[PDB]
Swiss-Prot record, chain B:
Topology of this chain in the membrane: Peripheral membrane protein
EF-hand domain location: 13-48, 49-84
Any GO molecular function: copper ion binding
Principal location class: secreted
Tissue specificity note: Predominantly expressed by neutrophils, monocytes and activated macrophages. Expressed by eosinophils and macrophages in asthmatic airways in regions where mast cells accumulate. Found in high concentrations in the serum of patients suffering from various inflammatory disorders, such as rheumatoid arthritis, psoriatic arthritis, Crohn's disease, ulcerative colitis, and Kawasaki disease.
UniProt-annotated binding residues for Cu cation: H16, D26, H86, H90
Primary role: S100A12 is a calcium-, zinc- and copper-binding protein which plays a prominent role in the regulation of inflammatory processes and immune response. Its pro-inflammatory activity involves recruitment of leukocytes, promotion of cytokine and chemokine production, and regulation of leukocyte adhesion and migration. Acts as an alarmin or a danger associated molecular pattern (DAMP) molecule and stimulates innate immune cells via binding to receptor for advanced glycation endproducts (AGER).
UniProt-listed CDD domains: calgranulins
Organism: Homo sapiens (Human)
Keywords: Antibiotic, Antimicrobial, Calcium, Cell membrane, Copper, Cytoplasm, Cytoskeleton, Fungicide, Immunity, Inflammatory response, Innate immunity, Membrane, Metal-binding, Repeat, Secreted, Zinc
Annotated positions binding Zn(2+): H16, D26, H86, H90
UniProt binding sites for Ca(2+) 2: D62, N64, D66, Q68, E73
Protein's recorded name: Protein S100-A12
Length: 88, 92
């Protein structure tokens, strides 16, 4: 795998680390997802100064989740990560 | 940074290693994005169907290859690649 592809695989690996733990191996409960995000994106979250974006990440977690839904969250975290790399 | 965060930063880093090279420092042409797709995703995006998803997003990645693509658009490609990377783990 390329460097880019190692990153994609690693993201998939982290998902699976959480998703394997209970029930079906490829999905996670909203509760488990909330825990994954709060731990694995702790620094990302701390650096987001727009509370509406944080709201975007956690939205609906109190209302199973699959990899496709997890991608949508990864996409948000990626936008945030890029913006932060340009912090003066 | 967590391992997940290092991978996010790594993805941003790879975009920037391409974007910084010519033109505007934070974008790349559609031509350059094709080069990134062909090289960096050689083991991930491999068939007509996955290239079709990408073409839909970029209005045909081969057309208007001077057009600039920003990080937000590149995210749409990373999302397609992640889906393929995941599907791959369940092939065997
Ligand atoms: Na599970
Ligand atoms: Zn899976
Ligand atoms: Zn940038």
């Amino acid at each position: 795998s390329t460097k880019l592809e190692e990153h994609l695989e690693g993201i998939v690996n982290i998902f699976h680390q959480y998703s394997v733990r209970k029930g079906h191996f490829d999905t996670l409960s909203k509760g488990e997802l909330k825990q994954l995000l709060t731990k694995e994106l702790a620094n990302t979250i701390k650096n987001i100064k727009d509370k509406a974006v944080i709201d975007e990440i956690f939205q609906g977690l109190d209302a199973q989740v699959d990899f496709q839904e997890f991608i949508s969250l990864v996409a948000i975290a990626l936008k945030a990560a890029h913006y932060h790399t340009h912090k003066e």
